[PDB]
RNA sequence: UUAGUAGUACACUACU
């Protein structure tokens, strides 16, 4: 990026400097260094000459020197650069800054002065100031004339390297306040106050009394003093803040020492995990569980592991519906024996008989299905009636009627009372997992499963996934394709998939399942069936299977019993009562399952594939809560047990509680138990990779991947990365929303009331010194607040200004999202009236639904609560957008500034109320959400937001960093430590290491000195705080508001009052919880809920110290940061004692914490400091009121846990798996494209977090599978659109119609779904383009499109383009989307929806809205900027029936079934499809394909229509421009192993609602005026201004009068398509893990491309031309130049690196003339360099050719006193093209380029004795700049570099190679606790030249070739063998020159030239033996043939296989020559 | 709103 020379000198100046005024100048010099750097590279980007601080009076003299500068008055300014074209002078003053505030100042200053001579000379002078952003990198130019000149400018600039120097300078001097004084943009500017008057009540409040009670009396007054302090009044802002700092400095200075001095007190005794410590924990766990749960040893109490019973399919019987129905009927009737429900199952088969009348079932059912398939809506009013067939009364296809005559009254009861459990109505029941005869039973269940499921399907291993994605999986990694087959083949896959396909059909049936009906559900298996019994939503089902022989059935613990029938055996499973939410997951279980297996097995050959799948079905299908209780606690139980410092005992003895209800759970528990002990013995089995560090980051970082560790869930060995996956991944198998709300509300309530009681009874004291639970070290707090509050205001002065802007404090409440959102909200008051009326309605609807059930199968309160509970404070649920509307209409909210309204609300609202609703997430331990009043939301907003922008300043806080941005931060901080550790070790041990190499004589004396030295120590505290919210003093936060400098006194009074009320805040127990406790039935022994509510009197309990979970994150997080800031100071004083160095780095995120400590020792042992660090860690937490959970907290020597994002020893790594398990049931079930959109987004996310392409593609397959399974769009399904459309396969069917996503992953990762459309257009620009222009930019290939011929194209090719233009372009672009008939639902709670009723009811008032909205069309798309505007927007919104539904929650489970059932019904309205073709009702999916073709065939494809596609898609979006370029200019290079992974940021490829108001009326309300100009162009170029008006203007003559509906609906479309153009998208933080650091776009592109090709090897990427094009106005000049630079940089270095010094000019001269780099002649590139204005870059090149003149030297010398003859003399002994002396010791620079580019050279061969330097250029292996790599290289690699034309003495011929020394890589151990070797590049000695390397290679490798090709006991001598050699090398020329043969020839050649036998080799033709007659050149193939067989061969590596293949090839080939398949008639003609 | 009466409608259908 930047120059290396200036970096080194600026780094040294930071250490050299001591005083702040010296450090000041280093910051000033760094600005100019960046200033010129931007200018140097931009001048080449614009092709102009570079200049610096050139006077304006001289700039005119270049244009017109006839008038002298004295008489003509020119403005005396100092511009940077100038240009004169088109009779206009353009003045340049480039500058790099974040804001244009510094640019407009210099703009108007220049514009004013330049006008003095602008009218004097009558030549207009334009000011062109170019500014670039130093982080986001965006170009900003003010000149409009300059915009039209340069359409696109190349800006791949690097500031990343500049900020590295800034970090160093603001580290040493950043602590000193003398340096902070010098950096200022106003010193300190405090903005306008948010309030006018203070708060008197705050000083009176009893909580403020209680605050000062505990506090000491000097502190009491200080708090008074601090609040009343105004920062704007006193001379400086830090008057008070420093004053209170200096008071507490007595106790602080002492307490910092106190903690630090404990380093000597410590011992080598810390909570370390050990086999016994784990064992002890388990035993106390057993005791706990055996009390807390009812332990059972009986095998009848178990629950099903899986809720399914699979049995082998029967191919002998027919696979057809009607047949199976009767088959199961007779089968069920035929059941023989006696049980409980035997005669019940018997009659059920009897009630589904058809027999003779099989054909009547085929018709009757098809009529009913056809009746429903006609209508969009369901068939209402008409009564469904059954038809008597044999004994059964069929109601629908596979639906029957329960006939009360066919079953006994007693036998009907048995089935429903006992078996189905309809009418059945104290510890939990669990299985003893410590019983070996229970663990046995559990193991035998697995042994049983493996015995049956391992057996193959025997059916074709070809399903949609493999059929359509197999190709794209296989090419990524062939292993995974096979792995997939291995699964699909095995009964495992058929078992799950048939349960999936069966459940889909169980749900589909269960929807219309009545109370007098039992339904039958069949699957792809013709033995497996299911019976769905009447449900009293709840699905009641049994799996009924007809397995072959007895016990050829899989029972996981689900089966009721097997039964013998009259033909075979039939088994019926226990009645399962599951919920649709659970069942859904079972349907998507195969996708979950495949991923599980593939992820585990991936690239690990030691694992048993049949054992992975054996475990996987029991996970992917496990829907019980038994499993979650294992999967979650395991993650910590393993990691704790393999960490260094960690408390396992306590975690296993308290936090671990198995709920082993099922039988898999028992087996899985013991898998975990065992895995805990294996960890302890593997702690030291972890190794640390050899770190190849050579300045600016490291490649080959992180942990060593060694397969020495042991797996957890199955047998085999595993890698660390894989071990971690096996540890953490299990938890993501867990299922969401399993927690029954009835139980959650109780346990959530109980906990809050338990911890509040704790505080009420036990915790009384607030502050303390000894450090105790819920206590803060008040003196230490106040100081550490003061110190940080200073540094978080000194580093940014406008801090109060930044808060106002970024959080919209000044603007009206109606603008901020958090307030105008559709989130849940709590309303307080009295609703006893409507709450009673809303309840009794449902209590009647209860009886309504019961009355109807009494007729068919006779099986069978809010008033009470209010009457019973006296002190019941009444509340209600509402919406956040609705509350705002309510508070405005009743006028308490206004257009007053939101903060100004907040301040008043803090003092107005005095009592705060909060309610909780459960999340019920995948975790077994349930999480609560506290949601209270809207009034509260406003208060917390300010307090939290003020802390937000404060927290952002501190780099330690990470809640500030949105998205997965933390991952890179982990890395950047880990790398800083790995570097520091090395740097510091080399700085101390250098004195000792010198003596070691000196003596190494006797080695017995060396060990004495090698012991007594410095010792490295790294450690990471992977923390997790205990009860961050509940067990935390809220009183401490009062001080943060008090001490605050950027808060006014009248604000400070008001903030603290609200917080004073947030102590007397009440928790409302929601009614649903109170209803559970309403019906007593004997109360709880010790009822905590009743205790706190006084035997249930009030529904409110007061919560004090427990500030509610998530309400004060940032606030608490700043105090956390302040706490860890102390921990730093503690250790940093402790390590100065021992005399060494320490680097502590703390990452803070509310409750999740990570703190990395790196120490270089001298005195005491490493293990002492380990215990010391942990002591002060808890101390640091507890001195601030927070307590650290030592249970979950673990410490490693590498690993970093932080928010579950993991960084290893530099190498960042997340659990790629967790995101692949999302693409299964994560969608809103809207449409085929709409579903896939989010399912592929989940796959895109995996790639970010370092996922292999092979597995990435799997998710893409699964996603498609589920997507197509939802709407019956799979191959062979109903809506299968391959026959309906013209196409070969689903790759060619548009993804809008649902097909497959045919694109490269490197595109899908970037854009996705749209990629599939983009690839179909790039395919064309690689088919329908000529030989010229195709190799050039994409832009050029788009110009040729309008010169194509339409007739050339094919049916499919035409088909895409027609939809792509007439449909896709304008309409998340979908065409097919099913519409529903859903109802609005109950919207009574809403106030705002009532005001729509009143405006709809009263006549005229409706139209009045729409007529008002037409004069303000800004309020159709965006919400109002003012009260009325926002309010009336809310009412209009209700117009949409979709927005009315949006505020109601539909179950995705129910939504899923509704898209299956409504697929054969008319759902897609064609009206909205045909409208576009023209500019009936709903249409069925099948008909939608037909009716699309009837319209499509009519449309016309032109040479223009196609050119609109290539404009609107490619040429419009600068991103799509580059993506297409990257895939056309792509040149994939060297395949390499993924050694070093690094984090990389996604690059850039680039007023809202107020602008649209200035479009409605052209007058705005200055910068916003300029924004409308480009908006005018957008609407005029597309011409959508007229197109919209014409569409309305001709509709009023179509309809008749004035339709207000069309007046708006068409006007809204016009404003919504504006929104996307006007309101710009925020470039959110996206981090991709790549094989190296991506600085700029091009770098990112190359590394991204190469990461998503193969799994085993990543590839480095090249490009012919620049890929970064900006549009279709910008059509090469800037793409050419850089090629010339690359070329000559490459050549000069290749020449001075490898070619002999003596003959380097000749080489260059030969290369320049007859050669070409990247299809451009090197001469033309040289001419481009010579005609350029940066010749100073290529001084040594120009001198060597004789194209260097004095002007260049004079310029070069002026950039950073010379003569030509001086150079001519000086460089008489320096022979290099990359370097010439331009002084006494100053050499010239050529700037080295990478050597992976030399392949892009194409010229005639240059032969040098024997070597062909062209082939050395074209070589891959022999281009490394490492001596050892080339010395220890293969002869196969070198054998390409030989021609020799009969040379001699190989030693002589190698004279044309560099006899200059090469660079070797040396490595050394670092002497850390995690001991690793650093490897770096040295310069070797002298005898390490390129020649000697080649020679040593030749010698070593030829010796091995000789002994392999002896074929006798002689050698490479003895003509008896030379004859054999001649024979073997003869055939090689008379056969076929493939690739294997030629190598042998050239190797033999080499070997014979070496031995001095190259005076005959060239005169070696076929011997006399083989040649019958010498003259008559006849060949005896038979002889030759038998000669090849008669060759013995050798088995020495590496030639053993080489020779073997050669022989076979040559034999086969020879035999081929003979074998000529002649025509049968041919010979019959000749003779 | 309130009450009474009569109703409430459909997927897989496979190499198995
Ligand atoms: Zn030769």
Author numbering: 0 to 424, 438 to 548, 555 to 878, 892 to 1031, 1037 to 1407, 1423 to 1530, 1544 to 1614, 1622 to 1636, ...
Sentences from the study reporting this entry:
To reveal the structure of the C-terminal region of LACV-L and the overall architecture of the complete polymerase, we determined the structure of full length LACV-L (LACV-L FL) by X-ray crystallography and high-resolution cryo-EM. The previously unobserved C-terminal region (1752–2263) protrudes away from the core and forms an elongated arc-shaped structure that includes the mid domain (residues 1752–1841 and 1978–2025), the CBD (residues 1842–1977), and the ZBD (residues 2026–2263). We also capture snapshots of LACV polymerase in both pre-initiation and elongation-mimicking states, thereby revealing, amongst other conformational changes, the movement of the priming loop that unblocks the active site cavity and permits accommodation of a 10-base-pair template-product duplex, characteristic of elongation.
LACV-L FL was crystallized and its structure solved at 4.0 Å resolution by molecular replacement using LACV-L1-1750 as a template, revealing two molecules in the asymmetric unit. There was clear extra density showing repositioning of the endonuclease and for the previously missing C-terminal region, but the resolution was insufficient for building an accurate model. The X-ray and cryo-EM structures reveal the same overall arrangement of LACV-L FL.
